[PDB]
């Protein structure tokens, strides 16, 4: 019986582009990290058995963390808009995602939440194909994701890469 | 693995 | 890296005639699947797209499209065809990292002979 | 609903030729395409948000600005008969959905 977890986290600057951090967890430990204001802004193991991999690995992951701060960058820039926020502002946008996995290999349960500064914002049902909103601005996302497909999307890595790359992580001991 | 990016709000 | 290749160029159907428009695209890994067709004088518009599950993706006019893993296709199908359908159709794939960069296939022209 | 603009321009080589895009949408993912017999669509340059701008595939004697979340531009500073096509403008709000623009249509005279 076990689990995966990712918390991708961004706080607007003012005006530059803001402080990015991605963490993962399994069986609730936490076993890497990503941060952008470290001199050598990278993915680093933060447990022992993760050390074995080749660096393409990190480097590719760490591909992926850029994606991120361009993406989280330009959604906070968003969410201003729709609660019609002043710019000046200094927000908090989170990810939160990953699957259940039973003892058997199978899927049990997957996760893919998002929160504006600190408040629950949009999340996904256990139907995993429904999506329940908190509030009215969370609404006009959920129009667009539901109508558009959104679950689908993020149905492939959960469904897919997830389980894979826990039964990868899990081979040590 | 790190999901890439997720849609646009 | 990635390519997209489109078998005809050139085809031409009778009307209510089964049609298989064919794409084959370039390996890896995880490619995200769409097909898009291009109306007389006009610019493209999205007719199908896949991301994961059920294998075929089906059109609310008719069309449908089955990815194959194992084959890398995309294929697009139609049981009737009618003379409204007489437009170019293209294939298009993105993958991981790329999600925002489409590789548009080579286009097909579609002849209904009335 | 995405327009772009000139609809059709004629120039010749050494020229100078700016192509624009408005949508009046929230689409934060703009494109610029050219559409040919023979070789279909290839990417060009395209741009994640105002003032972004990303390299596409064919991007060669080609520029583009992101004024605006809603204004893409393709900069043409220098004609040569082999950009001679026809172009297309794009916007997404989701990976690979996208809504196209009328096109414009450039003839590049020797």
């Known amino acids: 019986p076990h689990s995966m977890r990712y918390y991708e986290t961004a706080t607007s600057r003012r005006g530059g582009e803001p402080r990015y951090t991605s963490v993962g967890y399994v069986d609730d430990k936490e076993f890497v990290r990503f941060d952008s204001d470290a001199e050598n802004p990278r993915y680093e193991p933060q447990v022992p058995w993760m050390e074995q991999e080749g660096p393409e690995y990190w480097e590719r992951i760490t591909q992926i963390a850029k994606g991120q701060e361009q993406w989280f960058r330009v959604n906070l820039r968003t969410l201003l808009g729709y609660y019609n926020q002043s710019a000046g502002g200094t927000h908090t946008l989170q990810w939160m995602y990953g699957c259940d996995v039973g003892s058997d290999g199978r899927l049990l349960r997957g996760y893919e939440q998002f929160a504006y500064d600190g408040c629950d914002y949009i999340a996904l049902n256990e139907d995993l194909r429904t999506w329940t909103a908190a509030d009215m601005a969370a609404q006009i996302t959920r129009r667009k994701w539901e109508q558009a497909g959104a679950a689908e999307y993020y149905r492939a890595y959960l469904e897919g890469e997830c389980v894979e790359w826990l039964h990868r992580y899990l081979k040590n001991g | 693995m790190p999901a890439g990016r997720p849609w646009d709000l | 890296a990635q390519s997209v290749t489109q078998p005809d160029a050139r085809v031409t159907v009778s009307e209510g005639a089964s049609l298989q428009l064919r794409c084959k695209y370039s390996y890896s890994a995880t490619p995200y699947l769409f097909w898009y067709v291009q109306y007389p004088r006009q610019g493209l518009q999205m007719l199908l797209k896949?991301?994961?599950?059920?294998?075929v993706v089906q059109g609310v006019n008719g069309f449908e499209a089955e990815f194959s893993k194992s084959d890398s296709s995309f294929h697009l199908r139609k049981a009737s065809v009618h003379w409204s359908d007489s437009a170019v159709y293209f294939c298009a794939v993105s993958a991981k990292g790329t999600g925002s960069k489409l590789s548009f296939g080579k286009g097909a022209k579609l002849t209904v002979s009335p | 609903a995405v327009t772009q603009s000139p609809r059709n321009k004629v120039t010749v080589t050494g020229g100078n030729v700016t192509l624009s895009c408005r949508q009046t949408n929230s689409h934060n993912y703009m494109y610029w395409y050219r559409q040919d017999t023979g070789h279909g669509l290839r990417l060009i340059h395209y741009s994640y948000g105002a003032g972004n701008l990303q390299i596409g595939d064919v991007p060669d004697g080609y520029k583009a600005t992101r004024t605006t979340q809603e204004d893409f531009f393709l900069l043409l500073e220098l004609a040569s008969p082999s950009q001679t096509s026809l172009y297309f403008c794009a916007s997404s709000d989701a990976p690979g959905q996208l809504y196209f623009g009328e096109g414009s249509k450039l003839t590049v005279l020797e």
């Open positions: 896949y991301y994961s599950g059920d294998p």
